[PDB]
Amino acid sequence: GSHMSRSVYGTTLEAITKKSLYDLSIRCHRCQRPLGPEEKQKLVDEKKRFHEIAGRWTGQCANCWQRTRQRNETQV
Ligand SMILES: [Zn+2]
């Protein structure tokens, strides 16, 4: 609803958003597509924050991000 750009942790989502990471449809802010399981996990895994705008959550999907790591071999 009337919310603003806020970045919080997964454990904070569990309480505020009141649904677990796995269920909660968070989009990649670069793709506008939802995050898969590991992609949601990567943010909590690598200790990133999820970004809310107007009560809509967004993050970054590993689809782009995993491959954004240069020290990942040319296979995937
Ligand atoms: Zn993406």
Side-chain angles (χ1 to χ4, degrees):
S2 311
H3 301 214
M4 295 180 297
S5 45
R6 297 165 60 230
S7 316
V8 302
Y9 193 77
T11 315
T12 320
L13 295 175
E14 302 297 301
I16 301 181
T17 319
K18 206 162 285 57
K19 273 197 165 195
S20 303
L21 303 171
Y22 188 77
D23 177 296
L24 206 291
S25 303
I26 309 172
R27 295 186 180 176
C28 176
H29 203 105
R30 190 283 171 245
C31 309
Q32 293 299 330
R33 276 64 184 183
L35 311 177
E38 212 297 271
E39 316 195 279
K40 302 183 180 189
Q41 290 298 149
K42 284 274 66 65
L43 310 173
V44 183
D45 189 27
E46 301 187 28
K47 286 56 185 167
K48 274 64 182 186
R49 281 69 184 152
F50 299 82
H51 202 101
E52 176 191 77
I53 313 79
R56 177 69 280 113
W57 295 91
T58 51
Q60 169 162 88
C61 65
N63 274 268
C64 41
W65 187 33
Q66 202 73 271
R67 185 57 282 165
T68 303
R69 276 76 85 107
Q70 302 304 329
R71 264 297 177 193
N72 171 29
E73 307 309 279
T74 312
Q75 52 184 270
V76 185

